[PDB]
Ligand binder design. Structure first.
Ligand SMILES: *[C@@H]1O[C@H](CO)[C@@H](O)[C@H](O)[C@H]1NC(C)=O
Ligand SMILES: *[C@@H]1O[C@H](CO)[C@@H](O)[C@H](O)[C@H]1NC(C)=O
Ligand SMILES: *[C@@H]1O[C@H](CO)[C@@H](O)[C@H](O)[C@H]1NC(C)=O
Ligand SMILES: *[C@@H]1O[C@H](CO)[C@@H](O)[C@H](O)[C@H]1NC(C)=O
Ligand SMILES: *[C@@H]1O[C@H](CO)[C@@H](O)[C@H](O)[C@H]1NC(C)=O
Lengths: 269, 367, 342, 49, 269, 49
């Protein structure tokens, strides 16, 4: 399926060229494996709204975690196989007053450009029997005794976070056309665009000559339909369908193209 | 998450050229090679199961293997696939190895098991990737044409392909019986053991305990641990379930093929010069590339060759033009012309040289 | 590509098993008597003396057939189609019509009919074999008559059929001493071998410079013969002679002429126009060609025209707006022998 | 042994063919047509309605 | 989403003729539309397990109610437009002591051959304050004062019973084949059997020559395929699909056809 | 029946044709309706009467 992004009605004059804009930074891919399968997990430390977040430790997919402060070495620890079940939890071997603050567990996909985060408030007390982890309504709160370890759990069992296959190969753009009178599901496919570069045009040769997409479509994430020499046979309900099945993006944009109206027309959305 | 290997066993086989002069019984024994990709990768049917623990977990750094009725565990960084160099391993799953590997006349596999021994064995395999486009090359270039080609994708639960896994027949071990001066001491090692004897009393049957069998030697009898509780697949190097056809099982063979687009290097643009009616052309090759030419008249007069060194060749252009292509780049058209010198409107005869320029070898015949 | 499925050999200990006819393409079975296989602990069965080995083997389709395959097509006659750019009323219009002689296309009230091709020549023979980009003229063996090791050794009707025809010359041999394995004889693949001794494709060898593309298979720009074109031009485009300007006493001077592919002729025509307006300049002799359609005449001014010719001394008559002008030119040979455009 | 024969295109007419291989008893094969189908070239020019 | 009817594995010998059984009395129909849109309502009266039931009133679809007792004419009434909204309630103008017993409302559709019924026990008192309507756990019981009218509700608004297009026109039986090793959904269409009688076969001549169903298949509700001269290409998973989209019937039978076991075969299920 | 289809039944190879006569009852232009085909020189596309 897909989700409706934006609607517009397009009224253009006969003899002109229609350009139906369909752009998205989330459909960008390139004809090279520019570390798309590379993800990053990182723990950040802040101390309220009036402090600067500091990157504490991060870890690339299929890699080892890197900590930025030599003092924190062998003290802030992640599971080395964190990407197998999605347990991105951080164990602090021995805590001090300098560790108090909000820790955010941030997952980031460099290819999908998604970020997800959770917060935990760390406060260091002196009594170990008061040490607890609880949910204050929107975040976990850690009370930790001095010198005790603190295991802040960060578990994300989504398939994108665990070491599944995670390269789709079949990001696809569809250009669909809904003619007057045709019921749904029987809409004619106009154009198939695979992220790998393949394009598929449908219809008799006389029609294929009039339907085109820019040659660097996936390079800029621009799949705008250009149809030269607008005819009444170009009228209908067009839909751009972006499908990234593995990362769960399924969106469509709808364009009502009518070619029966001169330069007096008002734009929508 | 993708755990269908829950009852198979990473069986041990007989590898027919284990190196060091002779064949062996080995767990690592590859059986079937797949090379159907155009671009030059290899898919390997091996006798192991990689990335699965003995409790069928998703521990993707270990590997199961059979040795002496034991499914034991080693680790994933010990593998080496080789033909003439270490091949670049890409995809490890179960009986299935996906790798990319340079030019070589053989193929061996080898790795370190849990007892620190690099078991290695090979097969002959005339591995040569086919040419793509018009070029023989070395490495993936900066820029080139985008030709269709085929490769194996790293998905796992792909259906529409099957192999049949089943019950193992038996395994004869003569490491069991000991001669007690005419007796034998059959052990069981916590299993189900078949004996067969040329010995009165206990000649046939199936024992479950340790036995002492009177007045008949070790080699007079038989000993074979009969597994029932797990699965092996039908190998052509394993004896069958020795009564009839195979017990039904189900394992799909993962990592299927797909179309893909791959870059091929462009040619180096050659240097041309133009002589009277005909062309001369020096080429700059760096890896062996072919060159072909025809004309566009009635007949093709088609010629071609591969080249490796820099050559300067001449080509006669007829009045209907010429076409020559070189590398992946665009076919070069060429057309003749009404020459640099002739003989213009002059006070001497001074037409006939001109009357060669149009129409050589003819229309001087009507003179 | 085929796949030879060889299951586990049926070892019949101290007796003789017999395989029955189990119908499969190139089904092969052989029972070898007096075999003595060696296993981990010696002979696999204790009853040693009369062991026999039942060897079974069969060929089936590979999964790669869904991706990697060659198709044999029968091509008989081609439907011709053309794209024409027309400078009509000062504007470039593109028409797409079937060049078969029965496809009238009307654009801006102008009816176009490209006729039937004068020559019925086609570079394709009756039998074609296509592998995605390249197509070959090849006399493939008929269906059910394939030869071993050559193109057509394994044949199925469609990529998703279940029955398949196979001729691979599979004959099973007696296994070696002690080792348990299933030896089988030679089995080359004609499809995988054809990809090496394939030769030049039709893309490079076809005469007349035909460029062939696939998906669907087509021959582009085959320079063969001529073509008739009929134009039913409407009457709004025409203007009466009286409404057009009258021009008189025209003279032509040729300061430079070179018979070449490029703009080698330049002519300055002095004229006298009665009024302002457009005019169609045209050469009445086919041996010289004018590369300008419309000229704006004003009055007692001069026009410059570019012409291309093959004649060295071009004595030709030019009709502009129904008035005749004699032009006498002399043209020199060019400096260059090879041009990249015809 | 390859036997080449020619029969007329008549459906419902049984034709007898004599196979005479030297050193073997002759064999007569009976031939019966059922249908002869001519599939022409399908190229749609246009539709009307 | 098709309900399974019965599942079997069929093993027969090579060289023999296969008979793939697919039978259903609920798929019987003929070329004609002879009273297809015919439903019937009928109310029955019983008086416990040891008395004999009597049909009281019946009515055909688009028709008027028929009463069997002359005294009860113009006294026992259904809405003449009961079939438009599915309001099959029965209004009895005046009750008496002889009317006590269990009344059953029966709807029956002759094309789908469906019957549905519910019971209500009517008991006639003399005091109006004892009159109540309750659900005893499996049927409604109505207590009614003597001489009052009784509206016994029988409402079934299912699409098969209401007055709407109610014309099938496209029941189809499908024969499918799933080849060995080949996964489902990309299965080759083998046979389409349309309610009108037309069949559609696909594939090369080697397959079409051997697949047939008897010409009165849907007439007798027996869709068994007889395949002469069994070849290996016939082995596989066959599926007979009866589709009645209107009556909500979607059933299939699945057959694992293996070639083995000439007379020794165990017939599964 | 083209001379290009070998069929093996019970080890017997049958190859049939090619037809001696290339005659066909159809002309170059035909018009087909529901169950009827007509040999008709239909008007070309874009030039109807
Ligand atoms: C997550 O990892 C921590 C160690 O960092 C471990 O103690 C904890 O048990 C893990 N969670 C689960 C559910 O296994
Ligand atoms: C790849 O593309 C070709 C082009 O038609 C097609 O035949 C083949 O089935 C495709 N393979 C996949 C896996 O999509
Ligand atoms: C028509 O196309 C040709 C192509 O080069 C060009 O030279 C000419 O200027 C065009 N005419 C107009 C009016 O654009
Ligand atoms: C059914 O019809 C009766 C009249 O025959 C009417 O009184 C009653 O309200 C109807 N039922 C509903 C639910 O409206
Ligand atoms: C019958 O109707 C179907 C659908 O309305 C249509 O696709 C088909 O072409 C028709 N066939 C004939 C012979 O009219």
């Amino acid at each position: 399926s897909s989700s409706l992004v934006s609607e517009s009605v397009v009224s253009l004059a006969a003899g002109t060229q229609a350009v139906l804009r369909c752009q998205s930074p989330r459909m960008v891919w390139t004809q090279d494996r520019l570390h798309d399968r590379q993800r990053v997990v990182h723990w950040d430390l802040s101390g309220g709204p009036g402090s600067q977040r500091r990157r504490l430790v991060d870890m690339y997919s299929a890699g080892e975690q890197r900590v930025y402060e030599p003092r924190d070495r062998d003290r802030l620890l992640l599971s080395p196989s964190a990407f197998h079940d999605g347990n991105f939890s951080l164990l602090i071997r021995a805590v001090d007053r300098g560790d108090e603050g909000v820790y955010t567990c941030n997952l980031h996909h460099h290819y999908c450009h998604l970020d997800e985060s959770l917060a935990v408030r760390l406060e260091v007390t002196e009594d170990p029997l008061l040490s607890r982890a609880y949910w204050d309504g929107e975040k976990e709160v850690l009370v930790v005794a001095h010198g005790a370890p603190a295991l802040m759990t960060c578990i994300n069992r989504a398939h994108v976070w665990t070491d599944r296959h995670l390269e789709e190969a079949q990001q696809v753009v569809h250009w669909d056309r809904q003619l007057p009178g045709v019921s749904h599901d029987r809409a004619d496919r106009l154009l198939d665009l695979y992220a790998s570069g393949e394009r598929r045009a449908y219809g008799p040769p006389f029609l294929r000559d009039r339907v085109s997409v820019n040659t660097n479509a996936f390079a800029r994430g621009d799949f705008s339909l250009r149809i030269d020499e607008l005819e009444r046979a170009d009228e209908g309900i067009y839909s751009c369908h972006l499908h990234h099945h593995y990362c769960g993006l399924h969106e469509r944009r709808v364009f009502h193209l009518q070619v029966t109206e001169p330069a007096f027309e008002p734009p929508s959305a | 998450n993708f755990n269908v290997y829950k009852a198979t066993r990473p069986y041990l086989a007989h590898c027919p050229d284990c190196g060091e002069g002779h064949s062996c019984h080995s767990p690592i024994a590859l059986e079937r090679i797949r090379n159907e990709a155009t671009d030059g990768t290899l898919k390997i049917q091996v006798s192991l199961q990689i990335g699965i623990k003995t409790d069928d977990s998703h521990d993707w750094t270990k590997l199961r293997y059979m040795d002496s009725h034991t499914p034991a565990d080693a680790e994933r960084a010990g593998l080496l696939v080789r033909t003439s160099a270490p091949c670049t391993i890409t995809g490890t799953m179960g009986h299935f190895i996906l790798a990319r590997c340079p030019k070589g006349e053989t193929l061996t596999v080898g790795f370190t098991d849990s007892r620190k021994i690099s078991h290695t064995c090979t097969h002959p395999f005339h591995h040569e990737p086919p040419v793509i486009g018009r070029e023989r090359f070395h490495s993936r270039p900066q820029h080139g044409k985008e030709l269709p080609c085929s490769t194996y994708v790293q998905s796992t639960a792909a259906t529409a392909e099957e192999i049949e896994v089943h019950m193992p027949p038996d395994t004869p071990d003569r490491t069991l019986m000991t001669q007690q001066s005419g007796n034998v001491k059959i052990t069981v090692n916590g299993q189900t053991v078949r004996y067969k004897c040329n010995c009165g009393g206990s000649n046939e049957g199936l024992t479950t305990t340790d036995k002492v069998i009177n007045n008949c030697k070790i080699d007079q009898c038989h000993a074979a641990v009969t597994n029932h509780k797990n699965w092996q697949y039908n190998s052509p190097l394993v004896p069958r379930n020795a009564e009839l056809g195979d017990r039904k099982g189900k394992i799909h063979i993962p990592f299927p093929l797909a179309n893909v687009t791959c870059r091929v290097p462009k040619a180096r643009n050659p240097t041309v010069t133009y002589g009277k009616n005909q062309v001369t052309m020096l080429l700059y090759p760096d890896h062996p590339t072919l060159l072909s030419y025809r004309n566009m008249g009635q007949e093709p007069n088609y010629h071609e060759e591969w080249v490796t060194h820099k050559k300067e060749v001449t080509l006669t252009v007829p009045t209907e033009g010429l076409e020559v292509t070189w590398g992946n780049n665009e076919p070069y058209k060429y057309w003749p012309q009404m020459s640099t010198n002739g003989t213009a409107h002059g006070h001497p005869h001074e037409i006939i040289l001109y009357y060669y320029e149009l129409y050589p070898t003819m229309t001087v015949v009507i003179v | 590509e085929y796949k030879t499925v060889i299951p586990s050999p049926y070892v019949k200990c101290c007796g003789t098993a017999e395989c029955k006819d189990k119908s499969l393409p190139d089904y092969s079975c052989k029972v070898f008597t007096g075999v003595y296989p060696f296993m981990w602990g010696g002979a696999y069965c204790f009853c040693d003396a009369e062991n026999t080995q039942l060897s079974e083997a069969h060929v089936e389709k590979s999964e790669s057939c869904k991706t990697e395959f060659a198709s044999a097509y029968r091509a008989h006659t081609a439907s011709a189609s053309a794209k024409l750019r027309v400078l009509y009323q000062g504007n470039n219009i593109t028409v797409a019509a079937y060049a078969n002689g029965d496809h009238a296309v009307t654009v801006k009230d102008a009816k176009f009919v490209v006729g039937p091709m004068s020559s019925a020549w086609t570079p394709f023979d009756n039998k074609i074999v296509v592998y995605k980009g390249d197509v070959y003229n090849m006399d493939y063996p008929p269906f059910g008559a394939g030869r071993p090791g050559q193109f057509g050794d394994i044949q199925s009707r469609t990529p998703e059929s279940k029955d398949v025809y196979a001729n691979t010359q599979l004959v099973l041999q007696r296994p070696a001493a002690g080792t348990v394995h299933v030896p089988y004889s030679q089995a080359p693949s004609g499809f995988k071998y054809w990809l090496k001794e394939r030769g030049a494709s039709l893309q490079h060898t076809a005469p007349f410079g035909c460029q062939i593309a696939t998906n669907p298979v087509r021959a582009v720009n085959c320079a063969v013969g001529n073509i008739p074109i009929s134009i039913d031009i409407p009457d709004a485009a025409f203007t009466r002679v009286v409404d057009a300007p009258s021009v008189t006493d025209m003279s032509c001077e040729v300061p430079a002429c070179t018979h070449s592919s490029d703009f080698g002729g330049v002519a300055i025509i002095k004229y006298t126009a009665s009024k302002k307006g457009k005019c169609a300049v045209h050469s009445m002799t086919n041996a010289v060609t004018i590369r300008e359609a419309d000229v704006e005449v004003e009055g007692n001014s001069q026009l410059q025209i570019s012409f291309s010719t093959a004649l060295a001394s071009a004595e030709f008559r030019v009709q502009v707006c129904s008035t005749q002008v004699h032009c006498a030119a002399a043209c020199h040979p060019p400096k260059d022998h090879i041009v990249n455009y015809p | 042994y390859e036997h080449v024969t020619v029969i007329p295109n008549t459906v419902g007419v049984p034709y007898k063919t004599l196979v005479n291989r030297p050193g073997y008893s002759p064999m007569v094969l009976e031939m019966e047509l059922q249908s002869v189908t001519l599939e022409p070239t399908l190229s749609l020019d246009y539709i009307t309605c």
